[PDB]
Design a protein around this nucleic acid. Structure first.
Ligand code: ZN
Lengths: 83, 101, 217, 71, 132, 25, 221, 129, 56
RNA sequence: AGGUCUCGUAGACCGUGCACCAUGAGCACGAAUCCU
RNA sequence: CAGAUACCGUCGUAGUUCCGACCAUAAACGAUGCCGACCGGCGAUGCGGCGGCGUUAUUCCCAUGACCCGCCGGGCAGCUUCCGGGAAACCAAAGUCUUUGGGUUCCGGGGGGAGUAUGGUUGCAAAGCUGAAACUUAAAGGAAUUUGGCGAAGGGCACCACC
């Protein structure tokens, strides 16, 4: 990433998964990019802001992706706390 | 190579079972390996039942049945065409053959 | 997606859910499905909590309305229960339908005439639609599925717990998702019901069609 | 390695000695029977005088006779 | 045997799909139609095509066909799935609610509803086929 | 010659060699 | 000397919207078009053949022979690729190997041995790949050493662009296809290894579809 | 039976890290296990780790994150010197820019760079990267 | 609509081997080969030997 | 008081093991790229 | 049958059965050492224990047995899985292995000669354990793929086949 001068030497920084905090390469095509719309508190309409999350291919192949997205919405407050 | 999940028989924790004899042959085969067939038969076959009921003195006489159990060595079973070879993918089918009549 | 007082149910959506039999599930259980069930009752039917289905449905509606192009949403059906339901859903929300005979290699074979590039995929049953989930794995395609308590949650992202056996519940939640997607888009009202008729998404066999032919003119 | 213990070196050394002994090249190069049966006696060259000139054929695929000598 | 070829069957299916109001059940009449509206390089091929057209008419006049879509036979499917009844089959006066899901609904958000009643549970718990 | 009958032939040869060795002491 | 982009990615690349191939690698899009890489990487993408071996399937009347060509292509400042195609003759087998190698191309990362001065020259850590029975290691080396290996992975890492490596192979090394695919798999997973140099959470930039949906609904059906 | 509790604990946390879970139930407790997990926490590899008090043997629940590649044990305990340690990090560490070797020292359970700057050495314990 | 070239003879060796170069559409039976495909057979006198050419 | 109660009869598992049947000389098997 | 001291058929001595004294050999095979930790799901089975709507040992109660619904522990197994491994067949162990170290016993270095010769030991005997060498050889093998041949099976065809 960094040298003694301070320049950036890598071509790009790869994506990191939101749930498992793993690393996503250029060969795992099962990785998704979920966009979740943010709704205003009073009008119940789309405003223009979104909360995006990345899910790795291994945890989506295993089947534990849905509770990972559910916990992401729990931490972000999209889904209800009592639920 | 290993052809089957088991060894063509039905022992898992025994090591030894008592031997039985074939019917067509006299081959000594283990009991859980031999292909059993408990056939259910009766005295007359299809069309002699009308002649038997015509000659039977007792009206509404129920006919008896013959119950025997048949034990086969696998070579004598395949040569008698009671069991046939199957494909590699369709070998793992423990369901019995379907009965209709 | 329902933590506030504006995105909850008041009195009548629960009446629709209890009338359509959505709460009545199956007799077996998937190992990721104990989150959305209450407990076993008599005769072995698992009952589904309604707020969990509500929150997953509104999360699916948020995921649908979050993308811009509505034609990028692809609806898939294979069973007879949800054929006209996804057609009416694609007519309402602007999606793109495949109902019956999803050919293999639809999303991968790039020289076919029917080759399509979606961005969001929704199906009706991952057991009945085990084939488009494989191409959804082979491309970057997240899936939202309408799962029962027995359905395996493999290659899925947003799972709506429901009953997908009877056509009544399938049609009711396809209509339900249509109305919440049209509400979050900003076309129809929120306090005035949009419920002109909810039987348009219901599936019916032609035996009752000829029955009402005998009954009426 | 299989037996990994902090106070285990004689067992490893003896087992390595036995498995090194149970070889082919090491068994040939460290036994006297091979050099006793060696005509040259473990040397590169040797002298000799000629008894007679004979002839032997080749194997099955190649058809020729190779003219060796008896020394 | 007399089994038609992919060419004859495909041409007959596409000539039914394109043209429907200019044909019929008489073999000679739609033989003349098939001669006029298409280019067929033989008489025997024309007769085979017209024969399969007549068989397709005899199939079509009974019921629906799974290979051929006809515009006159179309609009009927959306005619049957556009109209709606007066009763929505979702708003009744009685809903069959078990006591277990009634106690579930009481825990959820409500204390009472205006359209729900409580039934009795079964005396015996059998729900699976006998298989051991 | 399979392995078992080769073993039997080798056993017979061993018996004959043992007998001639014990009679030729 | 013409191009009709059948895919959405091809139209986005042709219409001067996607800048480099790095973000395509970042979001991990499947590149189903060959000449995207031709448009991005120009004349610097040098190719050579590895081995053209024949495979034979016997029939009733004689035996039918086919030739399969192992061809590696790559740019000497990063990206490297590898492709195997089996066809009837040799020339179109070579062309199929070119197109399938240009389809399957991945970027690599380069690190330092001990001290971080200047441009990166060696692999960042001990990476290992495996296919068949062939196990290939890639171990970092000091500056100015050079690649020590068999000639086939040596030329593979030179077309990768790394100057310094230490290698240790194991297995049936003589099978050149398995050895080449094992070395390519070993070098491909350098972005599959997590290091403390990039422990920070990546900001989620949007996909190019999310900003060019207007252009694609103008240019497509 | 059981010989090393640190080996079983490290194998269990490595397996649960590869499966992708977030909580690990380390069933033994030891001073060396708590010190090893403390070193891993201080070098930014794990988070909040628990010690469940019991009158039989303590249990440790850790808060995993997607940060650990492999942690392992070197059994039996090999003593090293200061000059001898360089071969150990040559053949055990994956790189010189990262990775650590934890070795037992009279100053306590503590890693290899600190043991280098304190001019000391001792028995080895394990490694993590 | 389609063509193919066949060259037969001693091609860089001792045994005679034939090279067939097919692409496109090509029929072979019935009457239409009389007036859709045109056949020409020629002999080539190389230094090594002879060579035959069929183009249709 | 009425008089063969009703919807179709695939209303075949009746069949086990079936004589004698050996041998095969060999020379020939070839392993592929580019647009000017 | 050309030969048939072989397949087949009829007799038939040792042996097959029991006791007492020997030998320690099997495809003694799950062709997979023992102990211990971790690592997915599901329907079942045998045992012991715990909890519960109901039916029965004829109608009330309780405990016991017999069904049904679940849980715990040990075990013989089974289905499924892109955890993972392998050359593959396959294996929830044959996984946690180059990112190589939980403890420990035995055991193999290309094929043949050869489980052979000598020596020791044991046994009434047959044989068991230990176990070479000279020489010869460029392959001997394991898994899987495609026409191949079956006096292999399942469906069809032909007066260059038969009736
Ligand atoms: Zn028999």
């Amino acid at each position: 990433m960094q040298s003694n001068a301070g320049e950036f030497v890598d071509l790009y920084v790869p994506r990191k998964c939101s749930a498992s905090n793993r690393i996503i390469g250029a060969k795992d095509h099962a990785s998704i990019q979920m966009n979740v719309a943010e709704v205003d508190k009073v009008t119940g309409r789309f405003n223009g802001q979104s909360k995006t999350y990345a899910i790795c291919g291994a945890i989506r192949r295993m089947g534990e992706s849905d509770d990972s997205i559910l916990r992401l919405a729990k931490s972000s407050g999209i889904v209800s706390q009592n639920f | 190579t290993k052809k089957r999940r088991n060894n063509g028989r039905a022992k898992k924790g025994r090591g030894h079972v008592q031997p039985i004899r074939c019917t067509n042959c006299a081959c000594c085969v283990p009991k859980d390996k031999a292909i059993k067939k408990f056939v259910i038969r009766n005295i007359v076959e299809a069309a002699a039942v009308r002649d038997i009921s015509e000659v039977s003195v007792f009206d509404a006489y129920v006919l008896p049945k013959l119950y025997v159990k048949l034990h086969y060595c696998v070579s004598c079973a395949i040569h008698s065409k009671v069991v046939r070879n199957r494909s590699r993918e369709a070998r793992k089918d423990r369901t019995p053959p379907p009965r209709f009549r | 997606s329902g933590a506030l007082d504006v995105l909850q149910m008041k009195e009548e959506d629960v009446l629709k859910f209890l009338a359509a039999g959505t709460h009545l599930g199956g007799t077996n259980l998937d190992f990721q499905m104990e989150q959305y069930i209450y407990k076993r009752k008599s005769d072995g039917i698992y009952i589904i909590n309604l707020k969990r289905t509500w929150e997953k449905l509104l999360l699916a509606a948020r995921a649908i309305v979050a993308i811009e192009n509505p034609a990028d949403v692809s609806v898939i059906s294979s069973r007879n229960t949800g054929q006209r339901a996804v057609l009416k859903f694609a007519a309402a929300t602007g999606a793109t339908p495949i109902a019956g005979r999803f050919t293999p290699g639809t999303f991968t074979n790039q020289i076919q005439a029917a080759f399509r590039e979606p961005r969001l995929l929704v199906v009706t049953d991952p057991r009945a639609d085990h084939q488009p989930l494989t191409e959804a794995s082979y491309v970057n395609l997240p899936t939202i599925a309408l799962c029962n308590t027995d359905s395996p949650l493999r290659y899925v992202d947003i799972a709506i717990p429901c009953n997908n056996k009877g056509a009544h519940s399938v049609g009711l939640m396809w209509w339900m998702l249509a109305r919440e997607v049209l509400r979050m888009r900003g076309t129809i009202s929120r306090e005035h019901p949009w419920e002109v008729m909810p039987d348009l998404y219901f599936y019916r066999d032609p035996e009752e069609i000829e029955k009402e032919e005998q009954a009426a003119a | 390695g299989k037996c990994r213990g902090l106070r285990t070196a004689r067992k490893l050394r003896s087992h390595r000695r036995d498995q090194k002994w149970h070889d082919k090249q090491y068994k040939k190069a460290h036994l006297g029977t091979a050099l006793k049966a060696n005509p040259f006696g473990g040397a590169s060259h040797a002298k000799g005088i000629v008894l007679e000139k004979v002839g032997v054929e080749a194997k099955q695929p190649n058809s020729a006779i190779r003219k060796c000598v008896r020394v | 045997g007399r089994v038609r070829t992919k060419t004859v069957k495909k041409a007959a299916r596409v000539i039914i799909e394109k043209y429907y109001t200019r044909l019929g059940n008489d073999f000679h009449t739609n033989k003349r139609v098939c001669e006029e509206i298409a280019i067929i390089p033989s008489k025997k091929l024309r007769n085979k095509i017209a024969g399969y057209v007549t068989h397709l008419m005899k199939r079509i006049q009974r019921g629906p066909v799974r290979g051929i879509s006809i515009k006159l036979q179309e609009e009927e499917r959306e005619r049957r799935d556009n109209y709606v009844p007066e009763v929505s089959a979702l708003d009744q006066e009685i809903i069959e609610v078990d006591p277990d899901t009634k106690e579930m609904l009481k825990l959820l958000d409500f204390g009472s509803l205006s359209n729900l009643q409580v039934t009795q549970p079964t005396v015996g718990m059998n729900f699976k086929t006998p298989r051991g | 010659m399979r392995a078992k009958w080769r073993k039997k032939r080798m056993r017979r040869l061993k018996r004959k060699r043992r007998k001639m060795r014990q009679r030729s002491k | 000397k013409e191009w009709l982009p059948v895919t959405k990615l091809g139209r986005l690349v042709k219409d001067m919207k996607i800048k480099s191939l790095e973000e395509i690698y970042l979001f991990s899009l499947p590149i189903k078009e060959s000449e995207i890489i031709d448009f991005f990487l120009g004349a610097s993408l040098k190719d050579e053949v590895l081995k053209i071996m024949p495979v034979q399937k016997q029939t009733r009347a004689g035996q039918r022979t086919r030739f399969k060509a192992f061809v590696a292509i790559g740019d000497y400042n990063g990206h490297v690729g590898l492709g195997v195609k089996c066809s009837k003759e040799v020339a179109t087998a070579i062309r199929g190997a070119i197109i399938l190698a240009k389809l399957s191309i991945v970027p690599v990362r380069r690190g330092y041995w001990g001290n971080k001065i200047g441009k990166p020259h060696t692999v960042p850590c001990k990476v290992t790949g495996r296919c068949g029975s062939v196990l290939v290691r890639l171990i970092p080396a000091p500056r100015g050493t050079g690649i020590v290996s068999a000639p086939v992975p040596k030329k593979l890492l030179m077309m990768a662009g790394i100057d310094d490596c230490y290698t240790s192979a194991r297995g049936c090394t003589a099978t050149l296809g398995n050895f080449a695919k094992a070395t390519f798999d070993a070098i491909s997973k350098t972005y599959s290894y997590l290091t403390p140099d990039l422990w920070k959470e990546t900001v989620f930039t949007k996909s190019p579809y999310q900003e060019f949906t207007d252009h694609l609904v103008k240019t497509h059906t | 039976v059981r010989m090393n509790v640190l080996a079983d604990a490290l194998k269990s946390i490595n397996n649960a890290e590869k499966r992708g879970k977030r909580q690990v139930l380390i069933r033994p407790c030891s001073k060396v296990i708590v010190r090893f997990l403390t070193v891993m926490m201080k070098h930014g590899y794990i988070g909040e780790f628990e010690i469940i008090d019991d009158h039989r043997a303590g249990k440790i629940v850790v808060n995993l994150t997607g940060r650990l590649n492999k942690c392992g044990v070197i059994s039996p305990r090999f003593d090293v010197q200061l000059k001898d340690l360089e071969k150990w990090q040559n053949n055990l560490l994956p790189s010189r820019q990262f990775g650590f070797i934890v070795l037992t020292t009279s100053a306590g359970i503590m890693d290899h760079e600190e043991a280098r700057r304190k001019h000391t050495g001792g028995k080895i314990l394990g490694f993590f990267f | 609509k389609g063509c193919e070239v066949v060259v037969s003879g001693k091609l860089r060796g001792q045994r005679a081997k034939s090279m067939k170069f097919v692409d496109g559409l090509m029929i072979h039976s019935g009457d239409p080969v009389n007036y859709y495909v045109d056949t020409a057979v020629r002999h080539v006198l190389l230094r090594q030997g002879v060579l035959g050419i069929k183009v249709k």
